[PDB]
C-alpha cells in the first residue's frame, strides 16, 4: 500500500528545526537566524483536522514569528537577551499553534550570524567603551568623595566640637 | 595498522535505531513500525565473547521482539497505549539481551505508519462525533439554565 | 553578503568533537582515540578578541592534551578507569581555555580503537581466568 506517519498523542517531546532566515534587526543590521521548536501533539484529531500538514504549518508560523520578532528587535537583544527572546518566541508560537492541538513547550533560537568582520569591530569597540565607562564612573565617584570630604573638613573646622559628642557614646 | 572499536563499559547510554518492521496488527491492520533501543554494555567480556556482533544481535532480537509484540497488539494499542508496549518491549528485550552482557534501559516505539487515508477517515469521524455531542450539551445546558432561571423567577415573584 | 556565527554568552552547553589521535599508550599499545569537549562561552568579548578563532584553538589544545594524557596511561586505564582520565582532561583543558572566556564543563573519551584482533584475544583469555577462579571456588567450597 501507501503508508503515512500516524498522528498520535506524543509521549516525549518532538523537535522541529526552523530553517535559516535572513532579516534585518530594528537596529538596522542584516542577520541570519534559525532556531528550534520543542512541541508535543496533544490532540491528534485537531492536528489532522485543522491544518493540512501541521508539521509544515508549525514550520510556517515559526518563520513568520522569528522574522517578525527580529524585525522589532535590536541587534543586542539577539546576542544578549536570549532567555527573553525564546520566551517571547514560545509565547507567540504556542498560542498560534493551539487551533491545531499542539502544545509548544519551548522555542530556543539556535545560531545567529552577522556580517563578517562585524563582531570583531563590535568586540574591539565594546572593550573600548567598557574602559571609557570605568574611567568616567570612577573619576565621578572621586569628584564626589572630594566634595563631601571638603565638606566635612569645613564643618570640622567651623565646629571644633562636632567630632566630640559623637565620640562620647563609644 | 588495522584497528577496531573496542568494547568498553558504557559510562553513558548508547542509542540504537531498530530497522522498520512492516506487519499486521492483531486487529488486522497493516503497519510499518520502528523503535529506539537504549542500552549500556555492562560486561564487555561477555559481549565480545558470546555473540559475533552484539550491536547486530541487539538489532535482531529487537527487530524480532517488536515484530512479535506488534502482531499481538490491537491497532488502538499502538496509538493510544504506546507506553504499556514500550515497557514490555524493554522487559522482553533486556532479558533476551542478558547472555551478551547488555543492559537495555528503555525501548521506545518511534513512528507508526498507517495505510494512508485511513487516518483522515478516523479523524473526520472523530471530529463529527465531538461536534454532535457539543450540540447536545449546549442545548441541555441552555435548557437547564432556563429552568433554574424560571425557578429563580418564582422565588422573587411570589416572595419579595 | 558573507556571514559568520556570532559568539554569544551560551545558555545551554556547546559540544566539540576532538578529531582522532593515533598514539601509543604508556603500556606501549597502539591506539586510536577520541573525545567530546562540553563547553559554554561565558565571556564573548574574551573569546572573539583574545584568540583568532576560539573553536580551532580549543580543538587544537584538546588534541594535544588528549594525546598526552593517553601516552601517560595504561591501556587498561583507557578502557577501565576512563572516568579518571576524563576528569584529568577536564581540569587541564578548562584551564587552558580561560584566556578565551570559555568554561569547559566535561571532556569525555568517546570511541577507543586497538589493533585488529587484540581485544578478541584479551577477551578470550580474560574469560579463561573466570573459568579458572570459578572452579578453584567450586572444589574449595564442596
CATH number at residue B100: 3.30.479.30
Structural domain count of chain C = 1
A58, A76, A139 from A134: Cα distances, Å: 47, 21, 8
- In chain C, residues with a C-beta closer than 8 Å to the C-beta of A126 are 45
**Contact (Cβ atoms closer than 8 angstroms) between residue A60 and residue A67:** no
Q: Which chains touch A (3 or more CB pairs under 8 A)?
A: B, C
**What angle is formed at CA A122 by the lines to CA A119 and CA A127, rounded to 5 degrees?**
125
* C-alpha distance across the termini of chain B, in Å: 104
Phi, psi of C54 (to 5 degrees): -60, -25
Instruction: Check residue C121 and report its DSSP letter.
Output: H
B67 and B47 in a single domain? The answer is yes
* C-alpha distance across the termini of chain A, in Å: 96
d(CA A123, CA C45): 6
A111 and A121 in a single domain? The answer is no
Task: Please tell me which residue of chain A has the smallest CA distance to C45.
Answer: A123
Is B9 within 8 Å of C80 when comparing Cβ atoms? Answer: yes
CB-based contacts of A152: which residues, under 8 Å, 6+ apart? Answer: none
- Report residue A116 CA to chain centroid gap: 22
Is A9 within 8 Å of B127 when comparing Cβ atoms? Answer: no
CATH number, position B159: 6.10.250.2090
A37, A52, A65, A110, C5 from A34: Cα distances, Å: 10, 24, 11, 6, 11
- Report residue B35 CA to chain centroid gap: 9
Task: Please tell me which residue of chain B has the smallest CA distance to A5.
Answer: B113
A148 and A76 in a single domain? The answer is no
A112 and A125 in a single domain? The answer is no
C83 conformational bin, left if phi > 0, alpha if psi -120 to 50, beta if neither = alpha
Q: How far is B99 from chain C (nearest CA, A)?
A: 14
Domain that holds residue B102: 3-116
B109 and B125 in a single domain? The answer is no
**Contact (Cβ atoms closer than 8 angstroms) between residue C123 and residue B51:** no
- In chain B, residues with a C-beta closer than 8 Å to the C-beta of A3 are 22, 32, 113-116
A17 and A98 in a single domain? The answer is yes
The reported resolution of this PDB entry, expressed in Å, is 3.2
Shortest CB distance from A11 goes to which of B78, B83, B124?
B83
Which residues 74-133 in chain C show a CB within 8 A of chain B? 79-80, 82-83, 108, 111-117, 119-120, 123-124, 126-127, 130
Is C126 within 8 Å of B9 when comparing Cβ atoms? Answer: no
Shortest CB distance from C6 goes to which of A83, A112, A130?
A112
**Contact (Cβ atoms closer than 8 angstroms) between residue B67 and residue B21:** yes
Is A114 within 8 Å of C3 when comparing Cβ atoms? Answer: yes
d(CA A118, CA C4): 9
Mutation target vs C (from A109, A114, A123, A128; most C CBs, 10 A cutoff): A123
A105 and A121 in a single domain? The answer is no
d(CA B94, CA B83): 16
**Contact (Cβ atoms closer than 8 angstroms) between residue B69 and residue B21:** no
B86 and B10 in a single domain? The answer is yes
Q: Which of A96, A98, A103 is nearest to A13 (CA)?
A: A103
d(CA C20, CA C31): 10
- In chain C, residues with a C-beta closer than 8 Å to the C-beta of A108 are 11-12
Is A12 within 8 Å of B130 when comparing Cβ atoms? Answer: no
Is C116 within 8 Å of B6 when comparing Cβ atoms? Answer: no
Q: Which of C97, C90, C38, C102 is nearest to C66 (CA)?
A: C90
What is the radius of gyration, based on Cα positions, of chain A? 29
The shares of helix, strand and coil residues in chain C, as percent rounded to the nearest 5, are: 45, 30, 25
A27 and A110 in a single domain? The answer is yes
Is A115 within 8 Å of C6 when comparing Cβ atoms? Answer: no
B8 and B74 in a single domain? The answer is yes
d(CA B68, CA A17): 34
Unique residue bearing C-alpha cell 580561560:
C98
- In chain C, residues with a C-beta closer than 8 Å to the C-beta of A115 are 1-4
Q: How many residues are recorded in chain B?
A: 160
Segments of chain B assigned E as strands: 3-5, 14-24, 30-41, 102-115
> What is the experimental method?
X-ray
**Contact (Cβ atoms closer than 8 angstroms) between residue C79 and residue B48:** no
B130 and B110 in a single domain? The answer is no
State the cell numbers at A143.
Answer: 569628584
A82 and A110 in a single domain? The answer is yes
Amino acid at each position: 500500500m501507501i503508508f503515512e506517519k500516524a498522528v498520535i498523542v506524543d509521549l516525549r517531546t518532538q523537535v522541529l528545526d526552523v530553517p535559516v532566515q535572513e532579516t534585518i534587526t530594528k537596529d538596522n543590521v542584516p542577520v541570519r537566524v534559525n532556531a528550534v521548536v520543542y512541541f508535543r501533539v496533544v490532540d491528534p484529531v485537531k492536528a489532522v483536522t485543522q491544518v493540512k500538514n501541521y508539521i509544515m504549518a508549525t514550520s510556517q508560523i515559526s518563520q513568520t514569528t522569528l522574522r517578525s520578532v527580529i524585525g522589532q528587535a535590536h541587534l543586542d537583544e539577539l546576542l544578549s537577551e536570549r532567555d527573553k527572546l525564546n520566551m517571547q518566541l514560545q509565547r507567540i508560537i504556542d498560542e498560534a499553534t493551539d487551533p491545531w492541538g499542539i502544545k509548544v513547550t519551548a522555542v530556543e533560537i539556535k545560531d545567529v550570524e552577522l556580517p563578517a568582520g562585524m563582531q570583531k569591530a563590535m568586540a574591539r569597540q565594546a572593550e573600548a567603551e567598557r574602559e571609557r565607562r570605568a574611567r568616567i564612573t570612577l573619576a565621578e565617584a572621586e569628584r564626589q568623595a572630594a566634595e563631601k570630604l571638603r565638606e566635612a573638613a569645613e564643618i570640622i573646622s567651623e565646629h571644633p566640637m562636632a567630632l566630640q559628642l559623637r565620640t562620647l557614646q563609644t
